[PDB]
RNA sequence: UUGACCUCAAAUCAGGUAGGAGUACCCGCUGAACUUAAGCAUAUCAAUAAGCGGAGGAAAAGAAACCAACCGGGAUUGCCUUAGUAACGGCGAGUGAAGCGGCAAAAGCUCAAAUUUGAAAUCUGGUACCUUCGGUGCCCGAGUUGUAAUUUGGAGAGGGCAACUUUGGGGCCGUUCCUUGUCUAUGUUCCUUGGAACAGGACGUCAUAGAGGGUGAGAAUCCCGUGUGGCGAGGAGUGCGGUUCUUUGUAAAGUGCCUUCGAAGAGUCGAGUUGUUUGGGAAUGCAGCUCUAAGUGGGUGGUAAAUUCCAUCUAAAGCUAAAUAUUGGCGAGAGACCGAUAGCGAACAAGUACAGUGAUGGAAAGAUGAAAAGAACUUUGAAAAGAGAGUGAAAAAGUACGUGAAAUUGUUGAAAGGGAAGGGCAUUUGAUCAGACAUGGUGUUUUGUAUU
RNA sequence: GGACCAAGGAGUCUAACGUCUAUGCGAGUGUUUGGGUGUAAAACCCAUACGCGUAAUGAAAGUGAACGUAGGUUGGGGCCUCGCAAGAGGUGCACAAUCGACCGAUCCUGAUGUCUUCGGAUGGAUUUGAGUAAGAGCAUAGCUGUUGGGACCCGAAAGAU
RNA sequence: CGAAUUUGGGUAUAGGGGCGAAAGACUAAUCGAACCAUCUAGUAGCUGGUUCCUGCCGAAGUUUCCCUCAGGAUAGCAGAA
RNA sequence: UGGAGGUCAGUGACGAAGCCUAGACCGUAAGGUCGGGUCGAACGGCCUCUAGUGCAGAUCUUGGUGGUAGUAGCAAAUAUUCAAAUGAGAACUUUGAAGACUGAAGUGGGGAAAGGUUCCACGUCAACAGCAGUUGGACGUGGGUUAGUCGAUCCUAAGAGAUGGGGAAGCUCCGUUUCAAAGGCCUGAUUUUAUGCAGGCCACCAUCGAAAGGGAAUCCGGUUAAGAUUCCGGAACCUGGA
RNA sequence: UAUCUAGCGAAACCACAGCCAAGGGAACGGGCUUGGCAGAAUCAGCGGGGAAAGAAGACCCUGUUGAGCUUGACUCUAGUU
RNA sequence: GUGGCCUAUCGAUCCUUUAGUCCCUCGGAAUUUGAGGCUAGAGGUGCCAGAAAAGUUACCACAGGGAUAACUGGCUUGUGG
């Protein structure tokens, strides 16, 4: 069973396995299906782009909010303040995500930044005109690419004033730490006369 | 060199279609070549077999070959003509069967579904 | 390849490279890590020290998002930069126009001294950094100013 | 996965003179009593059946892919290597062999035999004809009754009548330069394919696969460099600079003494 | 006793509906043991097999009583990854998810809880008519113990101020979808072998067609098809391009400012305990039993508890395409698969013959020939048949049929043989058998005078 | 065990891996979940992300790798200078032994300062790490070996629904 | 050998169950737990077998631990690189 | 050795593959090449790829075949013989003559279960009847089973089992008159109709379960190759209706 | 009956086979060694031998293989209280 | 002088418990209980590298063993003669 110098393999293959095996021999067949699916909704929403817009989202957790990346939908406030209702932006073709909430200035500035020139680059026929053939584009994503907000410049002045960025993390660490004895000891000396 | 999806370049689906056709599509599976001079005459080519026809047999042993088509053999996917035996050794004529497409049809059997035919396919009549 | 194997060698020879007198057979010492602590505590004492029992504290729910935390060498440090601008930082090290490196956009999340950075002044800005790390800046000039 | 085991077979133990393997039960049949569930039984389950999650496709290195798709375009222009693939371009002026875009616009059967007939492929061409042979097993009832050579690789850049063109000739093949298959560049592993490129297909070769001045145009790529700077290492040898610095040499056969 | 109402029945009352099958995939219930642990009881196998109930073309899930702790994401599903990780585990053997991230697909929503109260505005059915998946009248009936309109937390309602913006129904040509039909090139030219030319050789032709199959042997050009286009037929038909009448409607919907409100699901949440389950660990989900709430309340925030906060959702009600699954059904295309002891058990009158009372068990079995041309006729025999003849390219293809191996057998021939035979080394004896010429030619006394 | 003959008949495939070897690239590497394209399961192209690697150590909080020419000593292939002819000297990569230095853990010591008990400088210790000390890895493939799988083939007495 | 008799048909009892004037007897030639299918290719440290040629190298039955004694791990002996 | 990519513009109906051959050659060998015969449609060399890749064994699997071996044997139930006919052929068939046996709890005449056409005729002998066969329960072709009275059908027995109800996640289990609002009898009425009725008596709680139990009624004579209490002739009987 | 004949016609078993003595040998040989010897084809009997055939010894032991049964074994459980 | 003059006088994982650090953690932020860790002992496996474990089978079964008993034979000849 166990023999010369070898890492401890778990190899966890002691159920009926080999009945629940699925090799994807149909992966070259599945994304001919899905261009095929693309290609005819495209044919059927003829002149609209495939996909809707969707908004400038900060990625959650510690190891990702450095990044930015597509949301689910606009928020209410973001589409209030570019300037239409929810339902119509729905019609016309906007993810509108109602659970969202925009607690950032420079996040709420670029979504709406995002819908008006979202506005001004569509053309919308109207319900009873003479409908302007408007050659579609198939991709609201590549039209209205997701873009990394720079942070600063390159290149600028070196401003020393001596807290070599070490004892400040340790200090906030052992404040952190140590808040809640201090809060603490100063009740007792508060309360003891 | 196939293009279609719907067309099968596969050995044992078109055996096995052939040889379960049935009569409808033998008759198109048993099409026979006109004459030259019956091409210079119609304009078209091949045509299916018919029961009075005048036929060529123009290939095999029996080369060069005139007669009259007797019966066609769509089970057998042959063709009967006319005066083209064999004679048994107890002295009976039996039917000797040739396939279509190693004939010549040197006269037609005509009516309005073959002249229709023939119009379609291209021919002047 | 198939044709490349020992079976096809050992084709003719009766017992197949497996023995005469122990055949090879199922399962002679049990199956799996079978016996650790009885037959085979002979290997996994020479081999895998440590193997039985449990030494530290519990975590439950457990998130590696809270731990991502990549580190960045002072040697390392320079190849942030764009290479095409880097001999000319190097050349034109001077204040007023140090160049800023953003560690945590590079992907890093501490950087640590590995040593022997250029005298010339950087700005480096981290989320993290060691102690060394800071005081070799500060040498060539520079300075780490902490961001989030 | 069923196949040798639809039985009910049991062992029937040892003391009835008969091999312990299982057994059908039942009667009246000519099956009942019979061995089953073995390999080495009749109507039994062969050993190690053949399973669907064995390995089919194999991952190969991008980089690996483009050597030598590199070195099989290379080797295209190399006359011995076509020759010992057996290309019969020995009445062709010179290979690597070039057309105009005359060709890249042909649009007929005839037209494309005409160009082949002028630039000299037709006789790898009617090799292909000639070499039509029927297989030798059992593929032939497997959908490959017939083998014949490979010839001709005319490579475009723009397909206005190509592909149509040259798709009833036996053996050619046609392909633009952006995809240039390894598969066609080097048929069976052996290297120096024939090939008829067009003018554009080399202008667009020398931008695709990159050069000394010209970045490859796939991202991060660049062309393998040699581990030896020529390819005359008798050269090499026999140059001024090796030979004024060796011992006097021997005799290329020593005299068998005593 | 003029008659109701409620509850409960009866009708071969009027009209419907359910059951069974299939069950590959899907939704639940129920539920093992073999096996592993080198023994075995927890564990594992496995929340599997077997059993049961219920669907569809997908099902389920699904628009947060979610994830998080961030500079916050934002219905569900699936993939890559997280990850053989956190964790569970006689902490042994083993087991073992999720958040974030990148993608495929993306779609949202509606009920209860509100007085229409200046008019139950709602709906089944009967009857009548019509342009009949329905529409319109009248009539009972249902319903106030509540059917319509309006609202669903993202909100929203009521009341004021205030410019505005947008709509409509049913046909008809078409587009589009499914099915289906028809038309759309090129040699059977000459020679040799052959029973057959589809083989070889000569000369062609077409090619957007040199895929495949058939035809008496390997056929682009003999046939069907193949390739490229064209022309027809039957239905579905608001995915949309035109058109028909249809103005109705001081009708319907959206937005700006302010005020007052803002109902939101109970034997339920939650707690204890029990059993089961989970990676879930002072207890992950589920279920039984006991207790059993509240309204800045309630849930969650992966260590039990009490005190402060904070963050995030808003259960105990409901619908919803796509990505996703599919050893079943139907229609197709394929293979470095198998090739009649193989491949499905079955290439065949195969779930057949046969066996068992029964549940069930379950084979063997493909090939004459291009064409039966399947052997007329004669002779011997009571016949079966034989011997001739005959057909066939072949009868060394005769249905007991392609080739026809081995074991085993007959005949003939050769040889050996005193309780085996067979074998090695060596020769003899018999039988049998391969291997060097005359090739360049100095000599040339010689033909068809550079032909030996 | 084998009367005899014919046909069939037994170390396989897969998921994770160890050593070695070949190849590509190299502090990086890996296109093939997916997208684009296509003469259509092929070939060709693309990109974030993700995996492994580039940092370890500790149960954890956490901290986190240069007195020095990235050290001294012994030994070192090769190279360099020298001798027509002796042999010596310099430099010494890999690698081996040894003494050090650096990082983390443990035990001690405890500076200026002090949200007066936080901070932890400095100096140590017969202690300890799967570390540093001018990266070597990633990917594919091949034999061999391992583990779970029917697991080289055939074989129970049994147990369960 | 006139009965606690023999027997036809109908009927009841079904598998850890039945039935037994009791032998672990009988329960379809199957009983100290029937038969059928499936789990299941159940596990086996134990028997048997394990398919071509040549070339080079070439053993061990000993050490330690193990519910260890017909088995493993470990070191040794061996090959290869 | 099977299959795959390439190549030999490879071999081949003027004979591929396969098979037989004390014929030759090569290799230490695995094996490869060739001559001769048979055969009739495909196959091979080289560079690579791939695997369901090599058999003497496994009381191996399937099929086939031996020696034993013309061997053991075809010896229970007393037993056969003569002649003729039939026929190619007679120990075995048919007829006659003998001799026997079962011996009325039979080797007879019928039936039940079971079988399923074996019944009967004609024709016929390949296989079967462990010898034979002209015979047959065999093979081929046909023909044949007639009911008011015989039996089923009806009744209920042991028992089986819906409904009403209760249980069970459920397949289903219990229960058979239960804690149910459980129906089918008997004369006429209006008799411009329907049996809606100024009518009345009542309440037993499905159904299945016997070809031997219970029970309405048929006998004789004749008739066929094969049916007869069934057909025919005669003579009756029972039930229901009128 | 066996036996002989006409007809019909199996099976068990079978590595190859079938003369001994002694030796040695897995310690009881048909084969090997040394001797004795040794003549076709056979028929009926016969039971010395073939350690004859029948069956993966049922006795015994081993296995970390079971099952039937028992109990103050270990761990549970229907029911009951 | 780091127990007994020397050579014997003894014990893993998991769990519990104690002692020390009063140090680390309970992961939305704190305090106090509670729990979990770090280092060293103790509670013990005498089958002593450490399973939690009663019988019977003359009703029996399977995988094997001539590794192993009950016959012969073989060697020995104490004992018997």
Same mark, same amino acid.
């Given at each position: 069973?166990?023999?010369?110098?070898?890492?401890?393999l778990?190899?966890?293959?002691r159920?009926?396995?080999?009945?629940?095996?699925?090799?994807?021999?149909?992966?070259?067949?599945? %994304?001919?299906?899905?261009?095929?699916?693309?290609?005819?909704?495209?044919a059927?929403?003829?002149?609209?782009?495939?996909?809707?817009?969707?908004?400038?989202?900060?990625?959650?957790?510690?190891?990702?909010?450095?990044k930015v990346?597509?949301?689910?939908?606009?928020?209410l406030a973001?589409?209030?303040?570019a300037?239409?209702?929810?339902?119509?932006?729905?019609?016309?073709?906007?993810?509108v995500?109602?659970?969202?909430?925009?607690?950032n200035?420079?996040?709420?500035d670029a979504?709406v930044?995002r819908?008006?020139?979202?506005?001004?680059?569509?053309?919308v026929?109207?319900r009873?005109?003479?409908?302007?053939?408007?050659?579609?584009v198939?991709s609201?994503?590549?039209?209205?690419?997701?873009?990394?907000?720079?942070?600063d410049?390159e290149?600028?002045?070196?401003?020393?004033?001596?807290?070599?960025?070490?004892?400040?993390?340790?200090?906030?660490?052992?404040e952190?730490k140590?808040?809640?004895?201090?809060?603490?000891?100063?009740?007792?000396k508060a309360?003891a006369? | 060199?196939?293009?279609?999806?719907?067309?099968?370049?596969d050995?044992?689906?078109?055996?096995?279609?052939?040889?379960?056709?049935?009569?409808?599509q033998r008759?198109?599976?048993?099409?026979?070549?006109?004459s030259?001079?019956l091409?210079?005459?119609?304009?078209?080519?091949?045509?299916?077999?018919?029961?009075?026809?005048?036929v060529?047999?123009?290939?095999?042993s029996?080369?060069?070959?005139?007669?009259?088509?007797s019966?066609v053999?769509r089970?057998? !996917?042959?063709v009967?003509?006319?005066?083209?035996?064999?004679?048994?050794?107890?002295?009976?004529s039996?039917?000797?069967?040739?396939?279509?497409?190693?004939?010549?049809?040197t006269?037609?059997?005509?009516?309005?579904?073959? %002249?229709?035919?023939?119009?379609?396919?291209?021919?002047?009549? | 390849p198939?044709?490349?194997?020992?079976?096809?060698?050992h084709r003719?020879?009766?017992?197949?490279?497996?023995?005469?007198?122990?055949?090879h057979?199922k399962?002679?010492?049990?199956?799996?890590?079978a016996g650790?602590?009885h037959?085979?505590?002979?290997?996994?004492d020479?081999?895998?020290?440590?193997? !039985?029992?449990?030494?530290?504290m519990?975590?439950?729910?457990?998130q590696?998002?809270?731990?991502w935390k990549?580190?960045?060498?002072?040697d390392?440090?320079?190849?942030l930069?764009?290479?095409?601008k880097?001999d000319?930082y190097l050349?034109?090290?001077?204040?007023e126009?140090?160049?800023?490196?953003d560690?945590?956009?590079?992907?890093?999340?501490?950087?640590?001294?590995?040593?022997? #950075?250029?005298?010339?002044?950087?700005?480096?800005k981290?989320?993290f950094?060691?102690?060394?790390?800071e005081?070799?800046?500060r040498?060539?000039?520079?300075?780490?100013?902490?961001?989030? | 996965?069923?196949?040798?085991?639809?039985?009910?077979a049991?062992?029937?133990?040892?003391?009835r003179?008969?091999?312990?393997?299982?057994?059908?039960?039942?009667?009246?049949?000519?099956?009942?009593?019979?061995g089953?569930?073995?390999?080495?039984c009749?109507?039994?389950?062969?050993?190690?059946?053949?399973?669907?999650?064995?390995?089919?496709?194999?991952?190969?290195?991008?980089?690996?892919?483009?050597?030598?798709?590199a070195?099989?375009?290379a080797?295209?222009?190399?006359?011995?290597?076509?020759?010992?693939?057996?290309h019969?371009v020995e009445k062709?002026?010179?290979?690597?062999l070039?057309?105009?875009?005359?060709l890249?616009?042909?649009?007929?059967?005839?037209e494309?035999?005409?160009?082949?007939?002028?630039?000299?492929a037709?006789?790898?061409?009617?090799?292909?004809?000639?070499?039509?042979?029927?297989?030798?097993g059992?593929?032939?009832?497997?959908?490959?009754?017939?083998?014949?050579?490979?010839?001709?690789?005319?490579?475009?850049?723009?397909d206005?009548?190509?592909?149509?063109?040259?798709r009833?000739?036996?053996?050619?093949?046609?392909?633009?330069?952006?995809?240039?298959?390894?598969?066609?560049?080097?048929?069976?592993?052996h290297?120096g394919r024939?090939?008829?490129?067009?003018?554009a297909?080399?202008?667009?070769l020398?931008?695709?696969?990159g050069?000394?001045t010209?970045?490859?145009?796939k991202?991060?790529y660049?062309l393998?460099?040699?581990?030896?700077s020529?390819?005359?290492?008798?050269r090499?040898?026999?140059?001024?600079?090796?030979?004024?610095? #060796?011992?006097?040499?021997?005799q290329?056969?020593?005299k068998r003494?005593?």
């Open positions: 069973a166990i023999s010369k110098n070898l890492p401890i778990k190899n966890h293959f159920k009926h396995w080999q009945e629940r095996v699925k090799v994807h021999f149909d992966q070259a067949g599945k %994304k001919v299906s899905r261009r095929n699916a693309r290609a005819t909704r495209a059927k929403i003829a002149p609209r782009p495939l996909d809707l817009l969707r908004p400038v989202v900060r990625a959650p957790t510690v190891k990702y909010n450095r990346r597509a949301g689910r939908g606009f928020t973001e589409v209030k303040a300037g239409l209702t929810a339902a119509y932006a729905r019609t016309i073709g906007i993810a995500d109602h659970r969202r909430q925009n607690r200035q420079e996040i709420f979504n930044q819908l008006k020139e979202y506005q001004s680059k569509i053309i026929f109207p009873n005109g003479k409908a302007p053939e408007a050659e579609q198939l609201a994503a590549a039209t209205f690419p997701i873009a990394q907000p720079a942070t410049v290149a600028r002045a070196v401003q020393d004033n001596g807290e070599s960025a070490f004892r400040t993390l340790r200090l906030a660490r052992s952190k140590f808040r809640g004895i201090r809060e603490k000891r100063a009740r007792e309360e006369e | 060199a196939k293009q279609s999806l719907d067309v099968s370049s050995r044992r689906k078109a055996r096995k279609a052939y040889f379960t056709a049935p009569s409808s008759r198109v599976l048993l099409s026979a070549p006109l030259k001079e091409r210079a005459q119609y304009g078209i080519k091949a045509l299916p077999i018919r029961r009075d026809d005048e060529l047999v123009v290939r095999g029996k080369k060069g070959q005139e007669g009259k088509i019966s053999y089970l057998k !996917f042959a009967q003509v006319d005066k083209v035996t064999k004679e048994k050794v107890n002295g009976a039996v039917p000797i069967n040739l396939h279509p497409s190693k004939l010549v049809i006269k037609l059997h005509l009516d309005k579904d073959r %002249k229709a035919l023939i119009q379609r396919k291209g021919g002047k009549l | 198939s044709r490349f194997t020992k079976t096809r060698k003719g020879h009766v017992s197949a490279g497996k023995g005469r007198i122990g055949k057979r399962h002679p010492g049990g199956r799996g890590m650790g602590q037959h085979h505590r002979i290997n996994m020479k081999y895998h020290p440590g193997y !039985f029992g449990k030494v530290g519990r975590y439950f729910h457990k590696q998002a809270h731990f990549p580190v960045l060498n002072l390392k440090l320079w190849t930069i764009p290479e095409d880097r000319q050349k034109s090290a001077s204040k126009t140090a160049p800023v490196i560690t945590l956009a590079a992907g890093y999340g501490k950087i640590l001294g590995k040593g022997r #950075i250029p005298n010339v002044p950087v700005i480096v981290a989320r950094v060691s102690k060394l790390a005081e070799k800046i040498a060539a000039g520079g300075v780490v100013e902490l961001i989030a | 996965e069923k196949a040798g085991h639809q039985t009910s049991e062992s029937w133990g040892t003391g003179a008969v091999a312990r393997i299982p057994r059908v039960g039942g009667g009246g049949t000519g099956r009942s009593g019979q089953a569930f073995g390999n080495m009749r109507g039994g389950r062969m050993f190690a059946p053949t399973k669907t999650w064995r390995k089919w496709n194999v991952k190969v290195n991008h980089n690996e892919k483009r050597y030598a798709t070195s099989a375009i080797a295209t222009a190399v006359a011995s290597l076509v020759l010992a693939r057996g019969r062709i002026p010179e290979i690597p070039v057309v105009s875009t005359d890249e616009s042909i649009q007929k059967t005839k494309a035999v005409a160009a082949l007939k002028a630039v000299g037709h006789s790898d061409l009617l090799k292909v004809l000639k070499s039509k042979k029927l297989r030798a059992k593929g032939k009832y497997r959908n490959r009754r017939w083998t014949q050579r490979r010839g001709p690789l005319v490579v475009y850049a723009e206005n009548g190509i592909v149509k063109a040259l009833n000739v036996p053996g050619v093949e046609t392909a633009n330069v952006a995809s240039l298959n390894l598969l066609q560049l080097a048929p069976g592993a290297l024939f090939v008829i490129w067009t003018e297909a080399f202008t667009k020398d931008q695709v696969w050069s000394e010209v970045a490859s145009s991202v991060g660049t393998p460099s040699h581990i030896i020529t390819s005359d290492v008798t090499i040898i026999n140059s001024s600079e090796i030979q004024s610095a #060796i011992r006097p040499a021997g290329a056969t020593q003494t005593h």
